Write a protein that binds this ligand. Structure first.
Ligand SMILES: *[C@@H]1O[C@H](CO)[C@@H](O[C@@H]2O[C@H](CO)[C@@H](O[C@@H]3O[C@H](CO[C@H]4O[C@H](CO)[C@@H](O)[C@H](O)[C@@H]4O)[C@@H](O)[C@H](O[C@H]4O[C@H](CO)[C@@H](O)[C@H](O)[C@@H]4O)[C@@H]3O)[C@H](O)[C@H]2NC(C)=O)[C@H](O)[C@H]1NC(C)=O
Ligand SMILES: *[C@@H]1O[C@H](CO)[C@@H](O[C@@H]2O[C@H](CO)[C@@H](O[C@@H]3O[C@H](CO[C@H]4O[C@H](CO)[C@@H](O)[C@H](O)[C@@H]4O)[C@@H](O)[C@H](O[C@H]4O[C@H](CO)[C@@H](O)[C@H](O)[C@@H]4O)[C@@H]3O)[C@H](O)[C@H]2NC(C)=O)[C@H](O)[C@H]1NC(C)=O
Lengths: 336, 336
């Protein structure tokens, strides 16, 4: 758990969450790229069949259609499982970034108070100093990662075999405002302490800084901000086979839902089919589907790969760009 | 601007943002569904050609390859533009939901204070009452929409022709903590006012509720929470043709970036190709690509649609399920 072991702060959880989402997204993108390459190969061989050789080209088209349509169908499930996780991880990272900005508002700006006597919620006070609209805001926050952060929290460290837990920021960071506050009194503050120059309530003597007047009353919000904590959540049950935190068994925390989805995404294996455009002879001969489609296989495609390449892989003004161009169909219709 | 005119609260902005994202996502899903239907048709006709008729089936394959590969290529740009907007709108909705939860923390829980005399930041006070770790939290928040909310804020009201502005919650809701606070004093509170039963600082007489003791000093955070406001941002320039809020011209607010992306997504038109599985004769005859691929067209496909359907659309044990099954390639190899 190199990557998750490096999550110790809101910023580094954000980086883990975004980096794992993109990892799942790249896995799907890679598989879909492989499919489109295979469909471009089939279109390429379709034009060549239109130009013994015909049956051989059709053996490739049939083999290509079979394994590519199979893998496209086999992909949809793992695709959805992985995407559900990538969406939730990006959603969580968005959440954490928003809470980060708010928890950065740690300095308060006081308003002009208003002095009074007894009033809610100090019915027994002889003096009160009431503030409305005290605010706290921070400049735009940004996470700045070190070189090691991005080396540790990296798709290279997110293979399923090495992942057993996630680390998340505790919920209080996303739900709770925390602050320190202090009241100060001097003399006999009342409703007549209506000199507000120092953003407190003063009267008597010479009002001024540091409770200069005879009677003073005020407060300050000296600090705001909720401390982040971290929490570990395992992906698998004790035995290590099943995903923990299955939904449908009672209320769950965010970390539990995320851990379930990441576990299922890690287990959703993608079957990548053979790359048709770099296919070798021994790959086609050894392919089990080519038994039903077809020593005889060699007779038709070649007994050396150097031959199979030259006849079926290397071609020719281009077969591949044409059959994925605005003139793909006209090219096949003319030659047919 | 029926949908955006209905955004008046954080919850309804969230609904607009999520509803417009899904609209863009459905537009892409629809186009990709149309493509896969067309590729399944081409695979279907490929098997039938393997079973004059051959040239006619090949005319459909060529026409199908041409218009489907064209539309797949034409889709990639509008796809990326729309997805960039759907991602940012979902990211914004996540943001707003997190701020909503925090701005819902409007009731403070006071801590046991500590009494003192003069101390930072009241060096001139004779009495202070210091609180640490005052917190405010709310139960889990949820947006509950009315029937009209979902009728007004609806993909049916998000056609580009009717959209000219977006409405967003102002930034203070996502960045600023706001609170009211009041101090109360009675008598001569000092460092000896160390009776904290009422979560204030009391001594003298009979300390107790409502400043029962002779000397008292305390504060309360009576309310927290930042009021949401709304802001309008237009999508287009004054002339109405160009997208406003182009990036690269200086710092921008979130509403401006969103408005730019929504404008570009609204303008990114998707060219949907002809549905091959429901193709009519007059559609194929009138298709301009069929001129180069091909009165002669009718001779081969039929002079009535009822004929074109029976020969080329309606087929047969199924041609379509087979050519998208694990046995698609074996089906073509055997018949070829
Ligand atoms: C959802 O909510 C989150 C959290 O609030 C928002 O996240 C913030 O998004 C903004 C906008 O992208 C981020 O601001 C950007 O930060 C980039 C990094 O800046 C730092 O590092 C560079 C060096 O690489 C320093 O130069 C810089 O001073 C910072 O230290 C900047 O590169 C971006 O700059 C561009 O835009 C600004 C506009 O203010 C211009 O002034 C610049 O010239 C430049 O054009 C920008 O500043 C911010 O960091 C994010 N915060 C966090 C905590 O992640 C999401 O945007 C929001 N999403 C939506 C869609 O609502
Ligand atoms: C990013 O940050 C946001 C904002 O904080 C989080 O959004 C919250 O997400 C949770 C979890 O999905 C939401 O809670 C859910 O609300 C659903 C709607 O509940 C209301 O309406 C139903 C009737 O339809 C009432 O019965 C109910 O009382 C509410 O009035 C509930 O259906 C969900 O319930 C399920 O889970 C809970 C767990 O607490 C169980 O108790 C239930 O029995 C049930 O199994 C759930 O309560 C919450 O509303 C969202 N808040 C907002 C403001 O949107 C994101 O989750 C977070 N994302 C990530 C990935 O981190």
């Amino acid at each position: 758990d190199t990557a998750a072991g490096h999550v110790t702060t809101p910023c580094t959880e954000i980086l883990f969450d975004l980096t794992l989402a993109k990892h799942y997204e790249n896995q799907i993108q890679a598989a879909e790229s492989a499919l489109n390459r295979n469909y471009a190969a089939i279109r390429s061989w379709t034009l060549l069949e239109a130009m013994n050789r015909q049956n051989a080209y059709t053996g490739l088209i049939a083999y290509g259609i079979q394994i590519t349509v199979n893998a496209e169908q086999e992909l949809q499930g793992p695709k959805q499982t992985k995407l559900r996780a990538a969406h939730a991880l990006r959603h969580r990272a968005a959440n954490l970034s928003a809470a980060l900005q708010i928890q950065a508002a740690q300095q308060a700006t006081l308003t002009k108070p208003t002095a009074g006597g007894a009033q809610t919620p100090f019915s027994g006070a002889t003096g009160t100093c009431k503030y409305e609209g005290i605010t706290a805001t921070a400049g735009e926050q940004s996470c700045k990662y070190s070189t090691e952060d991005e080396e540790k929290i990296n798709a290279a460290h997110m293979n399923p075999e090495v992942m057993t837990q996630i680390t998340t920021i505790g919920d209080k960071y996303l739900t709770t405002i925390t602050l320190d506050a202090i009241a100060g009194s001097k003399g006999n503050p009342t409703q007549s302490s209506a000199t507000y120059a120092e953003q407190d309530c003063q009267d008597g003597g010479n009002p001024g800084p540091n409770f200069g007047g005879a009677n003073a009353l005020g407060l300050q919000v000296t600090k705001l901000g909720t401390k982040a904590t971290t929490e570990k959540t395992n992906l698998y049950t004790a035995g290590g086979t099943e995903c923990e935190h299955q939904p449908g068994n009672g209320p769950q925390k965010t970390k539990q839902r995320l851990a379930y989805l990441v576990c299922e995404a890690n287990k959703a294996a993608i079957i990548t089919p053979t790359d048709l455009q770099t296919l070798t002879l021994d790959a086609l001969i050894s392919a089990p589907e080519m038994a039903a489609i077809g020593q005889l296989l060699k007779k038709a495609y070649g007994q050396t790969n150097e031959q199979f390449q030259k006849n079926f892989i290397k071609p020719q003004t281009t077969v591949a760009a044409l059959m994925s161009s605005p003139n793909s169909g006209l090219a096949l219709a003319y030659h047919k």
